[PDB]
Amino acid sequence: PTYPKYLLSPETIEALRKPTFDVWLWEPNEMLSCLEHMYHDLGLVRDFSINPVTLRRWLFCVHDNYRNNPFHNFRHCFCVAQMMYSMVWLCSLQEKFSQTDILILMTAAICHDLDHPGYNNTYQINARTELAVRYNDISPLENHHCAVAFQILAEPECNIFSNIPPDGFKQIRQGMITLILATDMARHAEIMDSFKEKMENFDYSNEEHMTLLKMILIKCCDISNAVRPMEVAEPWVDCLLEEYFMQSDREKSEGLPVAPFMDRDKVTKATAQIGFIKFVLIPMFETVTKLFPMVEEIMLQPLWESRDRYEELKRIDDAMKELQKK
Amino acid sequence: PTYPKYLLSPETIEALRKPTFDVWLWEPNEMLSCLEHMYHDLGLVRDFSINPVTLRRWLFCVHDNYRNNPFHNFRHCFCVAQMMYSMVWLCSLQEKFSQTDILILMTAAICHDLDHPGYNNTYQINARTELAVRYNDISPLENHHCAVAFQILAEPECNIFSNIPPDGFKQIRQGMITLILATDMARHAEIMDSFKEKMENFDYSNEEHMTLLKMILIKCCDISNAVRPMEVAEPWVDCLLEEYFMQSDREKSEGLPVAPFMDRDKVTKATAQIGFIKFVLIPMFETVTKLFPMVEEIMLQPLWESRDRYEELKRIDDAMKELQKK
Numbered sequence: 001p002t003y004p005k006y007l008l009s010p011e012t013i014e015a016l017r018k019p020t021f022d023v024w025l026w027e028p029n030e031m032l033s034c035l036e037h038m039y040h041d042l043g044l045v046r047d048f049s050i051n052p053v054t055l056r057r058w059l060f061c062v063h064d065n066y067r068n069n070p071f072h073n074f075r076h077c078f079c080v081a082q083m084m085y086s087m088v089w090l091c092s093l094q095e096k097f098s099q100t101d102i103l104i105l106m107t108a109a110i111c112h113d114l115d116h117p118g119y120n121n122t123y124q125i126n127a128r129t130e131l132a133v134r135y136n137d138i139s140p141l142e143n144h145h146c147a148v149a150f151q152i153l154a155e156p157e158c159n160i161f162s163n164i165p166p167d168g169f170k171q172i173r174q175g176m177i178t179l180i181l182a183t184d185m186a187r188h189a190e191i192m193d194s195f196k197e198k199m200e201n202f203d204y205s206n207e208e209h210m211t212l213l214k215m216i217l218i219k220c221c222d223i224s225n226a227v228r229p230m231e232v233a234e235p236w237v238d239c240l241l242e243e244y245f246m247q248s249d250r251e252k253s254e255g256l257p258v259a260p261f262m263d264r265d266k267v268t269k270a271t272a273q274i275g276f277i278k279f280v281l282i283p284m285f286e287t288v289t290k291l292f293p294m295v296e297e298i299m300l301q302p303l304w305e306s307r308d309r310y311e312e313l314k315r316i317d318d319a320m321k322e323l324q325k326k
Numbered sequence: 327p328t329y330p331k332y333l334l335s336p337e338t339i340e341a342l343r344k345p346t347f348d349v350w351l352w353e354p355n356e357m358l359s360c361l362e363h364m365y366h367d368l369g370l371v372r373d374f375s376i377n378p379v380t381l382r383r384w385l386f387c388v389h390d391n392y393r394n395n396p397f398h399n400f401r402h403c404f405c406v407a408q409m410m411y412s413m414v415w416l417c418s419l420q421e422k423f424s425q426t427d428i429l430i431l432m433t434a435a436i437c438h439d440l441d442h443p444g445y446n447n448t449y450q451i452n453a454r455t456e457l458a459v460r461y462n463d464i465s466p467l468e469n470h471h472c473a474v475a476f477q478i479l480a481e482p483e484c485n486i487f488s489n490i491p492p493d494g495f496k497q498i499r500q501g502m503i504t505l506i507l508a509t510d511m512a513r514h515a516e517i518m519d520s521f522k523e524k525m526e527n528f529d530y531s532n533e534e535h536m537t538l539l540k541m542i543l544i545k546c547c548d549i550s551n552a553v554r555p556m557e558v559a560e561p562w563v564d565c566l567l568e569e570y571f572m573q574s575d576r577e578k579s580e581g582l583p584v585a586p587f588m589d590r591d592k593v594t595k596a597t598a599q600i601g602f603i604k605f606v607l608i609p610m611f612e613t614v615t616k617l618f619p620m621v622e623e624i625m626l627q628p629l630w631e632s633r634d635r636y637e638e639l640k641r642i643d644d645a646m647k648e649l650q651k652k
């Protein structure tokens with residue numbers, strides 16, 4: 001009568017293009033079909049002569065190399081790449097960007113957290129891990145993500161880039177690296193600044209302007225959870241906090257600095273979200289809206305709502321804990 | 327390491343181009359992935375804007391509409407379509423045919439036995455079945471295969487021709503009808519003569535000449551299982567005879583006429599093959615070799631070897647019956 005799960009119904013194909021898409025409904029293989037579809041639908045399979053079979057193997061290998069972390073997992077990977085896919089449609093990015101650029105944006109989005117250990121850079125550096133030693137305390141996680149990405153692509157079976165002349169590869173690889181390395185939150189302010197600076201007299205044919213825009217785009221998708229509808233956004237926060245508490249417990253247990261923002265004893269869902277939405281998320285999207293007006297209605301709207309929802313929740317949190325003493 | 331069965335190895339993708347391909351090793355879902363690969367690899371998806379998912383849904387629906395016959399089943403249609411794909415490479419057919427021609431050839435190969443009951447035309451006509459009545463004793467099975475083919479494509483989610491302009495559709499539809507109908511073995515000698523007549527002075531840009539070549543090609547692929555290595559060829563013969571025996575049993579049991587060549591009592595495997603190879607297969611391929619010289623060494627040769635092998639088995643079979651029969 002009807003078809004297997006991995007064949008996407010036309011309703012799904014439609015919803016995939018929109019930020020309201022419910023990421024929680026799907027299972028690993030379903031998600032892999034979606035990612036696969038994105039590559040065809042954006043015409044990347046066509047313009048880069050990607051063998052459609054290689055692509056499936058690549059996607060599967062990528063899935064294997066994500067870990068069973070509360071937040072930094074394949075579902076998140078999928079979530080980021082889906083957001084990226086929405087923005088290509090919403091902002092008509094194919095008008096402003098070459099196909100190469102779109103290829104870079106999508107691949108980097110899929111790859112950006114490969115083999116995340118579930119503990120942040122500060123953990124690596126303070127605990128003097130293999131990765132910190134290997135990368136000399138310079139964005140060890142992001143370097144490793146990027147290294148794993150190209151290890152997968154160096155494998156013949158998984159090499160979606162096999163039909164691209166060497167000079168194209170070099171350009172793609174350089175783009176991915178920049179993008180994946182830019183997801184390190186430590187660099188946030190720096191990148192924001194450079195962007196804001198160039199944002200004063202922006203030129204779509206100045207390569208350094210474009211590079212920064214791509215950087216901002218991936219950063220946007222990276223932390224775009226709070227942009228999604230409340231039902232979808234809310235569980236992600238719990239997962240993130242779960243991961244943070246796991247780290248601080250270890251850090252406490254081994255005698256390493258604990259970040260207050262990760263401390264089980266100091267942190268509440270609302271206080272965590274409020275400053276983050278208000279001071280990191282909102283300003284970042286505000287700046288993007290100057291280039292793409294539609295972003296306000298689609299991205300800023302629900303962020304404002306989330307801000308208000310969490311501010312109100314804090315009032316509640318405060319009133320309740322006040323009650324329990326005086 | 328561990329890729330699912332339905333992700334085809336690069337070795338598999340490779341062997342798919344040769345007529346030595348072992349059709350028996352594969353589960354339905356793998357056979358589906360192979361047929362999918364063919365449409366991409368030949369540029370059919372590209373040149374006809376076939377929605378990659380619709381292709382998959384279409385293939386699945388086609389699968390659903392094949393029956394569980396000993397011979398006339400989905401593995402057979404896969405086998406036929408795989409042989410056709412080999413022809414395209416072996417004989418460099420893309421230098422001779424439009425992409426529209428290829429699409430007709432592939433699609434008709436896939437659709438050519440849809441919903442086969444396991445009883446041939448002679449059975450339908452003599453038993454006055456519903457199909458024989460519907461089609462007035464004119465190639466009733468083949469007509470039925472077609473109708474199902476187009477009933478499948480009439481479903482929007484299965485319609486791999488959605489983005490083909492109406493003229494193109496009419497042209498494809500006409501081609502497919504001609505080819506599927508040419509698979510009725512009652513017409514074999516008629517078609518051979520027409521082709522041989524054209525063969526005296528063959529014109530690659532005469533439409534009548536090409537229509538006939540395409541008819542011969544589908545006919546070749548249809549009975550081509552006999553051209554594969556012994557290990558692959560022989561089981562098919564047992565399957566066909568199972569179907570034949572099932573029918574002749576019914577015909578005896580219902581007082582209908584029985585064809586000698588389908589008779590449990592009159593037929594040996596060896597004697598059936600020798601006859602078929604000598605008076606149907608070899609002459610057909612011999613005349614095709616005059617247009618495509620490479621066919622001799624890769625079809626005709628295995629056929630000669632086969633004919634010799636079965637001649638040996640016959641000597642041994644005869645000796646066995648010389649011990650029974652009282």
Ligand SMILES: CC(C)Cn1c(=O)n(C)c(=O)c2nc[nH]c21
Nearest residue numbers: 185222223225240261272273276
């Ligand atoms: C406060 C900030 C440095 C830590 N931080 C973060 O890095 N990401 C990605 C979040 O989604 C987030 N939410 C609260 N804090 C967060």
Ligand SMILES: CC(C)Cn1c(=O)n(C)c(=O)c2nc[nH]c21
Nearest residue numbers: 548549551552563566598599602
């Ligand atoms: C009965 C059999 C020896 C003849 N025969 C046949 O008629 N068709 C259609 C085949 O595909 C086939 N394959 C092997 N023999 C075959």
Ligand SMILES: [Cl-]
Nearest residue numbers: 300304305307
């Ligand atoms: Cl506001």
Ligand SMILES: [Mg+2]
Nearest residue numbers: 112113141183
């Ligand atoms: Mg990260």
Ligand SMILES: [Mg+2]
Nearest residue numbers: 438439509510
């Ligand atoms: Mg038939």
Ligand SMILES: [Zn+2]
Nearest residue numbers: 112113183222
């Ligand atoms: Zn991330």
Ligand SMILES: [Zn+2]
Nearest residue numbers: 438439509548
């Ligand atoms: Zn057949």
